[PDB]
Amino acid sequence: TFISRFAPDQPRKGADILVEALERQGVETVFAYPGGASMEIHQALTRSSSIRNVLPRHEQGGVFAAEGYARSSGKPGICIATSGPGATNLVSGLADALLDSVPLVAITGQVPRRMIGTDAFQETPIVEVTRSITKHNYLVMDVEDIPRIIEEAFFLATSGRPGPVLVDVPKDIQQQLAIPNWEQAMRLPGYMSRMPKPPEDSHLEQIVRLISESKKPVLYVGGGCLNSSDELGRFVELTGIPVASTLMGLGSYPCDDELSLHMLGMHGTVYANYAVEHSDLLLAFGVRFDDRVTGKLEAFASRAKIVHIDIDSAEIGKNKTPHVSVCGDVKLALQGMNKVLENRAEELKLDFGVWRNELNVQKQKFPLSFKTFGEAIPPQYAIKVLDELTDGKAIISTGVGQHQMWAAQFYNYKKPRQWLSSGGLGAMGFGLPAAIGASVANPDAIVVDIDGDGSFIMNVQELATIRVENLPVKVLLLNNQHLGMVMQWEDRFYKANRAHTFLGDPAQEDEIFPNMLLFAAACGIPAARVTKKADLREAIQTMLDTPGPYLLDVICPHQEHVLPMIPSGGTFNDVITEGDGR
Amino acid sequence: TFISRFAPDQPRKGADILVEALERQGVETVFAYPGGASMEIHQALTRSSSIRNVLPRHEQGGVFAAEGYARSSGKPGICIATSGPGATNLVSGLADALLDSVPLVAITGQVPRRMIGTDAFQETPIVEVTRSITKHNYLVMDVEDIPRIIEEAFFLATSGRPGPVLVDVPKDIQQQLAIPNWEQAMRLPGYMSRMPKPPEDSHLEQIVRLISESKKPVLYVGGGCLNSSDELGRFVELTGIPVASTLMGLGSYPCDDELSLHMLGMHGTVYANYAVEHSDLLLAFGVRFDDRVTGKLEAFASRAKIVHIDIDSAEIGKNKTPHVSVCGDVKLALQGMNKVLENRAEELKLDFGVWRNELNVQKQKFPLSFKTFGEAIPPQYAIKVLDELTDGKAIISTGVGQHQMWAAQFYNYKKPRQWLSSGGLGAMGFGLPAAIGASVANPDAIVVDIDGDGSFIMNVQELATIRVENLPVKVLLLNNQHLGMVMQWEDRFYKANRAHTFLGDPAQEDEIFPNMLLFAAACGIPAARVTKKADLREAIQTMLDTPGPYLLDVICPHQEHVLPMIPSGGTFNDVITEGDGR
Amino acid sequence: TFISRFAPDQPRKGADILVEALERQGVETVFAYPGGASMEIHQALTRSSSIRNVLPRHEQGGVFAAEGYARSSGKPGICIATSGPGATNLVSGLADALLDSVPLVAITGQVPRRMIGTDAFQETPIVEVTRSITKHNYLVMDVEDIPRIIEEAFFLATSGRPGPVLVDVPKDIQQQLAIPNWEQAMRLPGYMSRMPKPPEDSHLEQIVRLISESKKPVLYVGGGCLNSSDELGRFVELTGIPVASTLMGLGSYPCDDELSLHMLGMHGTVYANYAVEHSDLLLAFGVRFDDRVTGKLEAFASRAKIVHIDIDSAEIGKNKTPHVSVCGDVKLALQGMNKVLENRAEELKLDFGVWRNELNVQKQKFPLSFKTFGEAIPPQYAIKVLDELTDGKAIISTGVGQHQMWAAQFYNYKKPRQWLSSGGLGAMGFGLPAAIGASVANPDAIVVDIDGDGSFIMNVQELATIRVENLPVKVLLLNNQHLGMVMQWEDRFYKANRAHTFLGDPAQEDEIFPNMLLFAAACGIPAARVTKKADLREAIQTMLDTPGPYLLDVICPHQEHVLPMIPSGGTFNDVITEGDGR
Ligand SMILES: Cc1cc2nc3c(=O)[nH]c(=O)nc-3n(C[C@H](O)[C@H](O)[C@H](O)COP(=O)(O)OP(=O)(O)OC[C@H]3O[C@@H](n4cnc5c(N)ncnc54)[C@H](O)[C@@H]3O)c2cc1C
Ligand SMILES: Cc1cc2nc3c(=O)[nH]c(=O)nc-3n(C[C@H](O)[C@H](O)[C@H](O)COP(=O)(O)OP(=O)(O)OC[C@H]3O[C@@H](n4cnc5c(N)ncnc54)[C@H](O)[C@@H]3O)c2cc1C
Ligand SMILES: Cc1cc2nc3c(=O)[nH]c(=O)nc-3n(C[C@H](O)[C@H](O)[C@H](O)COP(=O)(O)OP(=O)(O)OC[C@H]3O[C@@H](n4cnc5c(N)ncnc54)[C@H](O)[C@@H]3O)c2cc1C
Ligand SMILES: COC(=O)c1ccccc1S(=O)(=O)NC(=O)Nc1nc(C)nc(OC)n1
Numbered sequence A, B, C: 001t002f003i004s005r006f007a008p009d010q011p012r013k014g015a016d017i018l019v020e021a022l023e024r025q026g027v028e029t030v031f032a033y034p035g036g037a038s039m040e041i042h043q044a045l046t047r048s049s050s051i052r053n054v055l056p057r058h059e060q061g062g063v064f065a066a067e068g069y070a071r072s073s074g075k076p077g078i079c080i081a082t083s084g085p086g087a088t089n090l091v092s093g094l095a096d097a098l099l100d101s102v103p104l105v106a107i108t109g110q111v112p113r114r115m116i117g118t119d120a121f122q123e124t125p126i127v128e129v130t131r132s133i134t135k136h137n138y139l140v141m142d143v144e145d146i147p148r149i150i151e152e153a154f155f156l157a158t159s160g161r162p163g164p165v166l167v168d169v170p171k172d173i174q175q176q177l178a179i180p181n182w183e184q185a186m187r188l189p190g191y192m193s194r195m196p197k198p199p200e201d202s203h204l205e206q207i208v209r210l211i212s213e214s215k216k217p218v219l220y221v222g223g224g225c226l227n228s229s230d231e232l233g234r235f236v237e238l239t240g241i242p243v244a245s246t247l248m249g250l251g252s253y254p255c256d257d258e259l260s261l262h263m264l265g266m267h268g269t270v271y272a273n274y275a276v277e278h279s280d281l282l283l284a285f286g287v288r289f290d291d292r293v294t295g296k297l298e299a300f301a302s303r304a305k306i307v308h309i310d311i312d313s314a315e316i317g318k319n320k321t322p323h324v325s326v327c328g329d330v331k332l333a334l335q336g337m338n339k340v341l342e343n344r345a346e347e348l349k350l351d352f353g354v355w356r357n358e359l360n361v362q363k364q365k366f367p368l369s370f371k372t373f374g375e376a377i378p379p380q381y382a383i384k385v386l387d388e389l390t391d392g393k394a395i396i397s398t399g400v401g402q403h404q405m406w407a408a409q410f411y412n413y414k415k416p417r418q419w420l421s422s423g424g425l426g427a428m429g430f431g432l433p434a435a436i437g438a439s440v441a442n443p444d445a446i447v448v449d450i451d452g453d454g455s456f457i458m459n460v461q462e463l464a465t466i467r468v469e470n471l472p473v474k475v476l477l478l479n480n481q482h483l484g485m486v487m488q489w490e491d492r493f494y495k496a497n498r499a500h501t502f503l504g505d506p507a508q509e510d511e512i513f514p515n516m517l518l519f520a521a522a523c524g525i526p527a528a529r530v531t532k533k534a535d536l537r538e539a540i541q542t543m544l545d546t547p548g549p550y551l552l553d554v555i556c557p558h559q560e561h562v563l564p565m566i567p568s569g570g571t572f573n574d575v576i577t578e579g580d581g582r
């Protein structure tokens, strides 16, 4: 089933063994930036015909690209960097992948073994630095271990709760000649013995019982459902329970469906948060009860029986104590409960119409809304138009801040892995690189980075990557000349006292700065600016129609505020629904 | 001697106490990028009138800027970032400051104390992550400790062997009201009891003895001498010993002086390495015997008595065992030895003319050299011209790679703190941000970033910072469309097999890509390109003469190789002195 | 409410502040062994009139004594040791207290601060060493922190899940003069915000629901119920559910009651394990699903709904996933469920007579049994007699091994804190020292150490402590000349191949060795030996009647085997019920 480029008895460099280790794992793409300690690895890379390398312009671009690749394909993302500065430049990406549970395998070059700990050239104790920001990590001490460690890394990064795994490879090991043993068994007894077994019928049937004994059920869906799109659908079909999603769960259940309550949390819909606030049964599937979502834990779903299904036991009962729990794959649980629900519909007679309408009225009285001023472009509107013109089938990556919230609020995702956004760590500059990985993973898809002017500029160097790699990446830049989300808090809680939130030039207060169009031009990427709400539709359509990469600079009034809003640590009763920075 | 903005009995936010803590330390500038967990700190910042904030476009820009500020002023650099992604984006800067021993104080916001360890919004265990890449770090657990911890941080960052110190401040502590006690004593008994005492006359006089009993003495100067410019000068004057400098020591002794052997090491002059190879007395002052400099330790200064004066005992005998050592401030030792040398000249009669000429001939036979092809611009030449037109009085910051080596080789530094380059970690993208800090620290100085096209693009977003802050930063971009240093190794040790070292567009092999001029234009920074060696002088002169920031895109043939070169782990006998990538 | 021996304005040594810190905590006894680094503390101790010190003969005796004191009084145990060897000699005790969740506060002297990390005289990084074997630990760096750290330590050791807390105090801090501030607030925001809130009626009532819907309920009681003796009683009274206890839970519910199924697990009764094996509802209160108890997790209570009430969330779902969980104080939950059970008895009509009899028959067919051979003394019998003559009201401490199991099997505890045994770590030599602490904590109680000849000899030096302190400690030494439990496994799984399990003298195979009677004599403790089952009753009675300490050397045939026995990782179907080493 696999053909090596070497004879089973022919010795080859550890670097070449590391690359074949990747090919044997099904790796087709990696994002690697060459450095002294990883030269061997890059040389081995060029000897490969099945693995393509997307050279980024910054190691951080590499990780974020790998994250996009992973988040949009369900496959693990692979990034490679040299020692020292190379490796430390991945740090934010690793922490981001760990907090969001995105499978990622990071390989870093290291100084030769004998040089470790001596303050050598371009040396950093990366394994020490990344131990708390990765699911697991390694320092290869012998070429003989390469096959086994690579297999283990991918396994660990992919199984259970996905996450990042870093593999540190000393240069001397990369140069050492050896004959790989692809038959080596993995040394993960503890981990493998702790892997959840499929859910028991007893547990699942008790849940279906609770569902039939409830009057106000609510589904609390998160990132753990990204691979249960179909199972969840059939489930909602058989129970008729309204679905509230987290930022990480967007797309598990179509936001356009009538049973969808959309996103809950700090910036969730008034009706989504309402449903939870008054539910008597909370079905938390693939969620981690984040503070962004729960606000004051005690007030969160205070009057309801909570069911929590998570693949990580450490998460069950971390913030909220469930009445019922199931440590396992939610995809399996949904399938199990689905069989039961089908072969008992007659006697169950599930009907939540009353509750559903109690919510549809809330959905009618307090829907997502925005205001249009003169000919200024409403960010929400731009995203609303993008949706329309792409028929909600585009892969959307974003930065962090207000634009991020709107991209989540005003675009309806049809499927999972269409939404690529940093939620746990919320790292700025994630948008452009993430789109790069996504595009490489989905060559025929519409990839759009809905970015902010602050987030966009942080990794603007990846524009060069986009041009050279010829990725049809579209950039919908919502330019508001400010660090949006932070200025919103300045307005709400600091009497609009600006403390370094303005990103333009004070010498020319009324001038878009910088001129993002020229950053695009510098990398041979066609771009245009839009300022009038009237030209928006045609502008976006152009971006979409023009083959290849494209940057649309959408100017927006900065005084916009993301609403609704439940202050940090607040209650549903503290939800803010009106106001802005005017 | 200090006037607070609050009454000694008036309670104020921890954030305001943290800022006054900075003002009481003499801080005038900080490089802070606002984030959720640090909002309070930024608000307190705007209440200050003595502290100016230079808002960067990326946290990494912030650290590197702080490093430049420090490296060019002898003062500690201060950068502030929010929690999570903010904090992790400083990692490379901290590691860089630790390896190069540059005083730096980094402050990061943190989620509220009660939220620590719960996987909160934008939370990362930064103190855990940075413990091995900082001199020391803290997690403030009470507003009462702010005054003391800030004082301790600056003390630790500034004293002994300078380095970075990170202070983690939970948001709730920033908001807590209290009355600061600026009288609190520091809790550093261990550290303070270990601080070296001034050198003993016995030790110093034994050295002067060794000097008088030697025939081939050589001074091995490094970054530890950056504050002993005058002392070292008088010393060389009284002994007439040739001076070899490390990359970090450039400028301690004028490279233009006839007694200067310039830089030694991997890319040091043939004569500098020769002097060491045959010296019978090595005066290692403020150096750490780096592998870049020593090559194979056993062959390094194998036939000579080694004297090592270092402020860090852990460094004495780490790689090479001295015959004589002095754990203390080299500035003090030089002064001590200088008194002795003056009051004994008569009986000492130091005369190393023979040795000096044995070297001046080597300096004549094997000098630094470059080749000029047709009208192509030689990078070495461009730097040679910059020197001339700036009369070697400019502050030079750089990226990493070939251009870095040439900037060190072909520019003569008159004083220390004129050279700002990442040597230990060798982090790319250091050049532009470093120049920003340097300029802010030296408003009337000529600041030039001699960058590479690969390093420049990594933090190209700081161009916006430069324009908005109106810093007269000049950028001498040596554009060679490649990752220079790595392609050099490809040519020498990999049969010129290119493995992702080309930074241009393959679709247009013969086209400068990206167009750096447009990156400059995007930020309203005047720029020009130069391709003919003939227009070089006028182009550079223009850059220098044009007020404000300026970017000169100097195109260079990529087949240039930095020479001479002693392969990694080699001997002086393996020194390569000829060849390139043609 | 408290009277200091110093004026509120009078400065005193840190050592004196540390002692008053203890007095203010209600400490009356401490077990401290003087050493160089703790001299100051001992001097301060003698100045106290409310605190008595029990000087042990070994630091390990000190900890184990403190454990006994704690385990038998519900109060925290306090031990003090000097630096270096003193501190490392507490290690086993700390690990033991952590695994069994016994509140303990350990104070260790340390070299002066400035000497830390320099390899000073009697220096060990105890805080580093004990971090993983203590609930939490500290290194006092300032005399000003003493009051606060002591308060925090006791709080942490006492609240939530009790455990050991070590406080490292440098000698210079002990000597520093200062004025204590007993008003200092604690810095435990994270911990205090995570402390479980009282159980919700919703959760509790759902449990009472499950109870009424079950036919085969079983109570799984552990050490977490040691303070819910009365609540549990009323609970069993209102539900009539059979009670199975763990080794740590013995005494929570009287083993003599007819509703008692006694101990379950590896060496639990056949009927106790049977009840669990066939229960349809498992009420796990204050247990941690230990491998000794569960055997193969999947087979454990495989056919029943599991309810787990634990004060530590980390324990809920660690080994077995419950159908219902309650993170909180089981004492509160029992009280809550008790109110509900009382005000609903009429409609509940709980009747488990059928199940109860299905078990009473198992209790009849497979009861605990032992065989008597000629006139040899059966260990089980000796313990059975002790019970009778003490009317099961004695406090029993033990060593580890077979005698430990029998002491648990053949003695009926009426109340909690009557049973003092090392269960998690299972540390030998715990018996004698533990009895010392217990006796000091319960001066009027009958304290008996049922020890093994191997465990007894390990800390036989504490006999001196017993005599000097005049503690009426009785020692029922079950002498079998072997390391009992290990020889049992040799017989069962190693064809009786003795591998260093014999503790007697091979030169005189048929001679009791050593002569424990003489160890007693050496410390002026009356002792006697018993070899005939006939003299047993009178011998034990004598021990009990003779005032003061007493040692009874009970000789037993070594071929006895503790039964029943479920092999490690086995199933109820693998339970061994017959055989020995004959
Ligand atoms: C500016 C900003 C504002 C934000 N505002 C909001 C907001 O208003 N509302 C909101 O929802 N979020 C918001 N967030 C995102 C937020 O920080 C959290 O990232 C998000 O709430 C996490 O949701 P999650 O727990 O569902 O997903 P994840 O964090 O991805 O967690 C998924 C969980 O599912 C489990 N799981 C994984 N795979 C499986 C499987 N196969 N079977 C069973 N279980 C599995 C995991 O182990 C884990 O516990 C915001 C972020 C930013 C940057
Ligand atoms: C591409 C590349 C190529 C390189 N090539 C070379 C090369 O060819 N030659 C070369 O020299 N370097 C080269 N380097 C730089 C190299 O990595 C090391 O950074 C440099 O050799 C370190 O020199 P140093 O030890 O003198 O200075 P530092 O690393 O700054 O160390 C200074 C030392 O002085 C001590 N000290 C500090 N203050 C005082 C005081 N007041 N009194 C007494 N002692 C004190 C310190 O504690 C420490 O041990 C290169 C780097 C890169 C990125
Ligand atoms: C030779 C040998 C043989 C052994 N054989 C057996 C055997 O056959 N059967 C057996 O049972 N054990 C046996 N053990 C003991 C065994 O190792 C474990 O110590 C014991 O099973 C632990 O029981 P536990 O979990 O109930 O108690 P603990 O270990 O004390 O755990 C108590 C639990 O209760 C929780 N809790 C504490 N306080 C409260 C509160 N107020 N409210 C709610 N929850 C609380 C804790 O946080 C924790 O999770 C043996 C040990 C040895 C040395
Ligand atoms: C990355 O460093 C190490 O891994 C490293 C660190 C310390 C000693 C020896 C090495 S090495 O001998 O095995 N490789 C090495 O030195 N490589 C390298 N590659 C480039 C492209 N430029 C330069 O030096 C200018 N060096």
Ligand SMILES: COC(=O)c1ccccc1S(=O)(=O)NC(=O)Nc1nc(C)nc(OC)n1
Residues within 6 Å of the ligand: A266, A291, A485, A486, A489, A568, A569, B035, B036, B037, B083, B110, B111, B112, B115, B120, B121, B122, B171, B172
């Ligand atoms: C940074 O997070 C914390 O420190 C943090 C983390 C977890 C809980 C509570 C906080 S907080 O209540 O004290 N501050 C906070 O939540 N700030 C904040 N600032 C901005 C500008 N945007 C958003 O949220 C979109 N939140």
Ligand SMILES: COC(=O)c1ccccc1S(=O)(=O)NC(=O)Nc1nc(C)nc(OC)n1
Residues within 6 Å of the ligand: C035, C036, C037, C083, C110, C111, C112, C115, C120, C121, C122, C171, C172
């Ligand atoms: C315990 O050591 C330290 O704590 C220690 C360790 C290193 C330096 C200084 C000390 S100290 O000066 O503060 N105390 C000290 O030296 N005490 C002590 N007590 C006895 C009873 N015997 C001996 O020495 C034979 N020394």
Ligand SMILES: [Mg+2]
Residues within 6 Å of the ligand: A401, A452, A453, A454, A455, A479, A480, A481, A482, A483, A484
């Ligand atoms: Mg913005």
Ligand SMILES: [Mg+2]
Residues within 6 Å of the ligand: B401, B452, B453, B454, B455, B479, B480, B481, B482, B483, B484
């Ligand atoms: Mg280049």
Ligand SMILES: [Mg+2]
Residues within 6 Å of the ligand: C401, C452, C453, C454, C455, C479, C480, C481, C482, C483, C484
């Ligand atoms: Mg024995």
